[PDB]
């Protein structure tokens, strides 16, 4: 039979005064009782999260803006489990609707770039404040913000500045808020890491490929958010999900090139020129690197040692050099067989040309 | 006449344990020699040694079976699976049915003592 | 109407949609779920939806109490809900009701009542 | 083992192994209950079982030996040993 | 011993052999009827596992399940065949011996017999 | 009335709690719901009949149930987890430090034998011998003694009333305790020569009874005067004692007199016939006495500090102090929950494959019809887990180990459906009924009916509205229920 691998018990009780009795063995038909809300399930991390939540029958409310990106989530659970709402941070009633009946809330909002309708401030600060005020009004028992690694309130990067302001506002309205701080995530169809090193015609670094970091598999961060949504010990806490092994950019690129058996192209042209070329590419409608991210190329990962980690959740986070084979074998060209010699004499026995 | 496929063996029920010993050993040898093919044909995310480990486990499963007819049945079923795997009939899912372990740890609480099973109503 | 959710929040629903049917408020059977308990348990799937357009058929328990009693001379009344307008049976099986007792008596299939002229 | 607290006799009704214990029960039970005034003495029968005694001293520590002997006196001494070997 | 273990070639799980109980029995003669045809066959039905028998769905009110043997009921001609099949498949079984009506004489005359003393009860028919 | 149709139903063959007879039945479920109960055949117990309580109390298994654990924080209950309540129980044990016989264990009607075993082994493992029934005088050991099965059972089996010639009823209304055996007495009274007597409250019986007193004084009078001679000169006489006698302070004075008469009159006690009988009114008491579960006199006088009461809803608020910690186990909230500081759901008879022992001493095995609802669990699992949470453990983990334990307690608990004779009748009446009961003096308090209402007897039945409608009607004061003859 199947199992409720996520739950430690069957009768759980939220901090809002709801009783949640589990039903079943933990398969597609089961129900965990819980009702959550994930504000970015359409994206890279939230997709894996809703998959792990709805595999066990947890009701999942998924706010969307594009109707067509989401459809790949309805597969993740039985009927009635995954529920969709059209929402926008510029409409408040939509946010109250999404969070009303929820025991858990999960904020994954945030672009790696600015737009015409949303600057970094409006999406990482004001959006967090709107959600927090609604999480507070309705007194939702749990709130699980995700704010980027290296976040610091004042910093050369505006992204990390906002991400730090989003932290303090959430925690200054919702005191029981949990905050996670993942490091650069990697996996299949990642944004800016392996699909780029494997597809992009040429890389560039305003520094050298020297920015140091601890990357991590995204499935494990999704496992972490699962092991935090249900553990009530994690209120008014902070996490640093970074990973065992420290990797410079050039190290990752060399492993990528080795596994791919193709020579990745890197250039290493200076800062102001790349910063200008990025600025001019922000006028075309599709996402591209933005002036504030080449700024983060000079900002290596400072880890906060006062915050919890994977080992506080009984997790064993994975290593990049093992997983790169699984993640890059599709782009492996595999030109041909090695050393065809000592095969002429064997081929000579077969009929190659029929008449 | 409807001729046999590639790696087909005619079903033949041996009357002795001493011959089936040899036939089983040849099957094990073929599985091992063909494991790299089982890694290439199926897009596998682990080692050839881990495949050989699982094969050894599957053969240790029925190591202590002394009824001759049941052994003949087991050998025939194993040759069926070798024919299914080496010819590219199985797809990835039906093959990785044999490798649950390699997939990521399913959650946190995997009960092993009584009290946890009771809290999860599995006792 | 304002319905309290389990999670401590509220659920506002207008009065026209809390009635069990447009002709009756209360439930007509002990195991029937009242519309308030329905909403309170299922608002995740009612949230952005329009309640005007959801199916709200009339109840029969109230439309059959309106039907006048019928009368007969004798200890039997025969019922067969037959259309008399089109061919075939189109009704329910013949049922002979006893009507000697003082009150009205209803067919078990249809609720039409019969009395002994008094 | 601070005290005896319960005694359980098991035996057949009509089998061969149990007759000496049947005599012990018919003849010595009141003396056993007076020499151990604080203990539940329980006799429970069932055809086909192998005669045997259980004692419970304290905190559930239970002891046991069979009583397939050929005399009432072997029963007395064997019972008494199990009552002493706490 | 020497009863073959067909459980190894059955292709079925081992949880049936290690954790699951069956019961072998004859269907009791119903009291709502007087027929006895549904009897004379030795059914075999699995015993319930509590967590996964049935549970009510939230969506529409249907009853779910995870026990895959909640509807399987093998029928046998005799007790010995049932027990052999169970042992050959390695299932653990409890036998439920039937309870038969005890024969006693019935006469129409006993309704109309003489009471030399006070009438115990007055008969209707 | 209209709830279901037969093809939809899962027929399961199980046992009828609500009486000590152990009437076999056939439950009919529709998934999680139990629609109805109907009888099953067994000629040595119920012979095609069952009472109305057992057929109409099913409606109490789907209302006022316990689905989650509860804790008391004041005047309110608060829903809680299993982890939290069991840890709360452990902290209460460690804070309170009950010593020896301060830990009380109460097992009521409608309990298995596995549960009472697990509660007994756990209690003793904490150093306590205060195991006790929910009966009025359950605090002290029974007058008739648990030593031999013959002293507290319906020895002459329920198939033995057909062979009866003379009968005596002491403090029992069989129409309210085991109606099925009242029906059997009447079936025998009509077609045979049978002469009956009663010493108890005048009981509106389905047969002629020849009432002759309500006191111990009239009891000794009849047993030594006329009906004594009727019982001597009978071939298969019966002396039926109610369990309400066991629920009196002067029970020894009775059981002594009856034992003196039994040993004195061969016709009641021979090598072919035991005409002494104790009719229990609940299905737990015989299994309890078979596994011990009687208070020791040392614990009988201690004022308990913790009170684990199991299926008990007949308590009086005087048996349980205020300053004690209390832990109810049950499947229905009617009385014992209201006292409790902690409430732990159990399962009803339809949701546990329990063993239940009846008056004859016949062990019957139940079947599970459905899974227990919600956050409910089988009892013996709950007591193993709390045991582990406490500073002790039980040495068994699954069913087979619990069964081997039962055999280690008593081997007739795993001889299902087999009723056994017994060789220690003379000794049993000499050792238990006559000896240690000479010191009790008889009261003048006239006997009272044990059951003031056949309906609304236990928790399942009090939670059934059908028993409420049926106890409002079917009352003697109503005109409909009395014919003017
Ligand atoms: N992936 C990584 O390497 C790292 C991620 N993070 C943080 O973790 C989270 C992961 O997001 P990621 O996994 O990167 O994939 P995305 O960043 O693509 O997830 C973005 C989600 O946010 C939603 N969203 C963005 N802007 C708005 C808006 N203005 N209004 C409403 N919804 C909006 C998107 O909705 P739609 O898709 O419908 O437009 C999408 O679902 C982000 O908060 C990111 O800052 C931190 C460090 C590293
Ligand atoms: Zn009609």
Coordinates of N, CA, C and O and ligand atoms in Angstrom, one line a residue, chain C residues 79-81 92-93 95 107-110 112 114, ligand 2:
Chain C
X79 N -55.1 4.6 -8.2 CA -54.2 5.6 -8.8 C -53.3 5.0 -9.9 O -52.8 3.9 -9.7
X80 N -53.1 5.8 -10.9 CA -52.2 5.4 -12.0 C -51.8 6.7 -12.7 O -52.6 7.2 -13.5
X81 N -50.7 7.3 -12.4 CA -50.4 8.6 -12.9 C -50.2 8.7 -14.4 O -49.2 9.1 -14.9
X92 N -47.3 5.4 -13.4 CA -46.8 4.5 -12.4 C -47.8 3.4 -12.1 O -49.0 3.5 -12.3
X93 N -47.3 2.3 -11.5 CA -48.1 1.1 -11.5 C -49.3 1.3 -10.6 O -49.4 2.1 -9.7
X95 N -52.2 1.2 -8.1 CA -52.1 1.1 -6.6 C -53.5 1.4 -6.0 O -54.0 2.5 -6.3
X107 N -50.8 8.0 -2.4 CA -50.2 7.0 -3.1 C -48.7 7.0 -2.7 O -48.1 8.0 -2.3
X108 N -48.1 5.8 -2.8 CA -46.7 5.7 -2.4 C -45.8 6.2 -3.5 O -44.6 6.6 -3.2
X109 N -46.2 6.2 -4.7 CA -45.4 6.6 -5.8 C -45.5 8.1 -6.0 O -44.5 8.9 -5.8
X110 N -46.6 8.6 -6.4 CA -47.0 10.0 -6.3 C -47.7 10.3 -5.0 O -48.3 9.5 -4.4
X112 N -50.3 12.1 -4.5 CA -51.7 12.5 -4.6 C -52.5 11.9 -3.5 O -52.4 10.7 -3.3
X114 N -56.2 11.0 -1.3 CA -57.6 10.6 -1.5 C -58.3 10.6 -0.2 O -57.6 10.3 0.9
Ligands
LIG2 ZN1 -50.2 7.4 -7.6

